[PDB]
């Protein structure tokens, strides 16, 4: 556990991966219900050309048993030994598969920070300012980086509001602010790109991750190098996801 | 000559190619100075995967000699027998390599129409309203389609102005309005895409082609299926024709 960050090139370096420099990094997510399912996925992903491995812990059936989470994290880390591992429990409020109280959610993340098996944790911006601040501090004290997140699965907020949220994430100490929004029109995709550009230009001093969801928003997953998003999600493995192989092809074609 | 057009799906069909439907089409350009150069380019492009061949006539040294231009169109057509051929003299004012009087430019396009060898001509929006109306009429009377164009190589107009130009092209009878603008900032690229969406959804009853130039605007060359541009330019920072098709296919699903 040790990561670096620079406000000159606006980068975060974890496990030798420099987020915020060069081409957008590909994040793939593990969604298994059991420990063996998580291993099957990790084995299947090991060959794929991705950069960061995200474990969606809300899909894990035994998330309330500390020993089981630790065992599954340990199993992933022994299959994917050199790529950064991001621990993500998506809350029910923001589309996650299970529900946990605020207290449990914070304890889960603190336990993931303690394990030494994860390089990063995902904390939701709207969890509560006191709780967010406390958990960011704890993660940082253990050399664990924080991706702070916010999702709107049904609409796209005004560009100014998207910018405001990303700024608040920086205010709260996020190492990498992250926002995903849902377009209802084609203009909404451009609104998300506008917000990304404005944030990068006016306020960002670290990498940021942004996305417009659905088939309509797929260009937001491809044009990060120009518009300013530092990472993008792909499936190894709906009609609005793009395969990791195809994402890598496009990113390479667009790389400058 | 023969082409079709439909305001239902907003398409123009020329030599079996349906512009405005499915994935955006790829236009490649011939830039040769001599008929021999033009022939070599066309031969080299013949086995590339592109949809429309554009002849950039302003690059042609013998443009003022009517028989030379006709012989060169004939030579291209012998090599590229199945793809639509777009005849384009880019004027000096809009970045073209040579200068012609308005009259000479109109005579050149009329001669192209008369040849029967070209499927489409490019006419510049700002050529002059009387001349544009007369030449669109002439092309149409001979079943030649018109791509009406406008370029700004140094800046991006306001979104409303981009839309206004595209609407004016429609009003003047363009089969396919086309605009290419240069971004000075990242936001300018988004302004071009915004204008594209606005035009296509609110006013267009036919295909439109839009582009934000430079490496910064590459996304405008890839995302036409969603935002509304019907075609994009490639060559056989710039993305190649092979790579362009790869990405367009990926986005088409
Ligand atoms: Mg169309």
From Swiss-Prot, chain A:
Which pathway does UniProt place it in? Answer: Metabolic intermediate biosynthesis; chorismate biosynthesis; chorismate from D-erythrose 4-phosphate and phosphoenolpyruvate: step 3/7
The record's catalysed reaction(s) read: 3-dehydroquinate = 3-dehydroshikimate + H2O
Which cysteines does the record link by disulfide bonds?
A: none
What SUPFAM superfamilies does this protein map onto? Aldolase
| SUBUNIT field | Homodimer.
The family database entries (InterPro entries) matched by this protein are listed as: 3-dehydroquinate_DH_AS, Aldolase_TIM, DHquinase_I, Type-I_3-dehydroquinase
Q: What is the effect of changing residue 241 to A?
A: Nearly abolishes enzyme activity
Protein name in the entry: 3-dehydroquinate dehydratase
Which PANTHER family would you find in this protein's record? 3-DEHYDROQUINATE DEHYDRATASE
Report if keyword Cell wall biogenesis/degradation is assigned. Answer: no
UniProt record similarity statement: Belongs to the type-I 3-dehydroquinase family.
According to its UniProt entry, the function of this protein is described as: Involved in the third step of the chorismate pathway, which leads to the biosynthesis of aromatic amino acids. Catalyzes the cis-dehydration of 3-dehydroquinate (DHQ) and introduces the first double bond of the aromatic ring to yield 3-dehydroshikimate. The reaction involves the formation of an imine intermediate between the keto group of 3-dehydroquinate and the epsilon-amino group of a Lys-178 at the active site.
Q: Which PROSITE patterns match?
A: DEHYDROQUINASE_I (PS01028)
UniProt keywords, alphabetically: Amino-acid biosynthesis, Aromatic amino acid biosynthesis, Lyase, Schiff base
The positions flagged as active site in the entry are: 151, 178
Q: Which GO terms describe its molecular function?
A: 3-dehydroquinate dehydratase activity
The annotated modulation of its activity is:
Inhibited by (2R)-2-methyl-3-dehydroquinic acid.
Keyword Amino-acid biosynthesis in annotation: yes
Please list the residues that bind 3-dehydroquinate: 29, 54-56, 90, 221, 241
Result for mutant: residue 94 to Q: Strong reduction of the catalytic efficiency and slight increase of the affinity for 3-dehydroquinate
Protein source organism: Salmonella typhimurium (strain LT2 / SGSC1412 / ATCC 700720)
Matching entries from NCBIfam families are given as: aroD (TIGR01093)
Can you tell which superkingdom this protein's organism belongs to? Bacteria
GO annotations under biological process? 3,4-dihydroxybenzoate biosynthetic process; amino acid biosynthetic process; aromatic amino acid family biosynthetic process; chorismate biosynthetic process
What would be the name of the gene that encodes this protein? aroD
């Amino acid at each position: 556990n040790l990561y670096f960050q620079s406000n000159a090139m606006k980068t975060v370096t974890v496990r030798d991966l420099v987020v915020g420099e060069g081409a957008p990094k590909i994040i793939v997510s593990l969604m298994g219900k059991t420990i063996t399912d998580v291993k099957s996925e990790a084995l299947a992903y090991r060959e794929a050309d991705f950069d960061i491995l995200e474990w969606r812990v809300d899909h894990f059936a035994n998330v309330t048993t500390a020993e089981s989470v630790l065992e599954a994290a340990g199993a992933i880390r022994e299959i994917i030994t050199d790529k950064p591992l991001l621990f993500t429990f998506r809350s029910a409020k923001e589309g996650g598969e299970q529900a946990l109280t605020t207290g449990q959610y914070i304890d889960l993340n603190r336990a993931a920070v303690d394990s030494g098996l994860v390089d990063m944790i995902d904390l939701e911006l709207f969890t509560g300012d006191d709780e967010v601040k406390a958990t960011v501090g704890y993660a940082h004290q253990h050399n664990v980086a924080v991706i702070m997140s916010n999702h709107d699965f049904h609409k796209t907020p005004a560009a100014e509001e998207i910018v405001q949220r990303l700024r608040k994430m920086q205010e709260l100490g996020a190492d990498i602010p992250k926002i995903a929004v849902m377009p209802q029109t084609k203009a909404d995709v451009l609104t998300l790109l506008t917000a990304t550009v404005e944030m990068q230009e006016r306020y960002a001093d670290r990498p940021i991750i942004t996305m417009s969801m659905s088939k309509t928003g797929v260009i937001s997953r491809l044009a990060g190098e120009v518009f300013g998003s530092a990472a993008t999600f792909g499936a190894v493995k709906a009609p609005g996801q793009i395969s990791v192989a195809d994402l890598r092809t496009v990113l390479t074609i667009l790389h400058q």
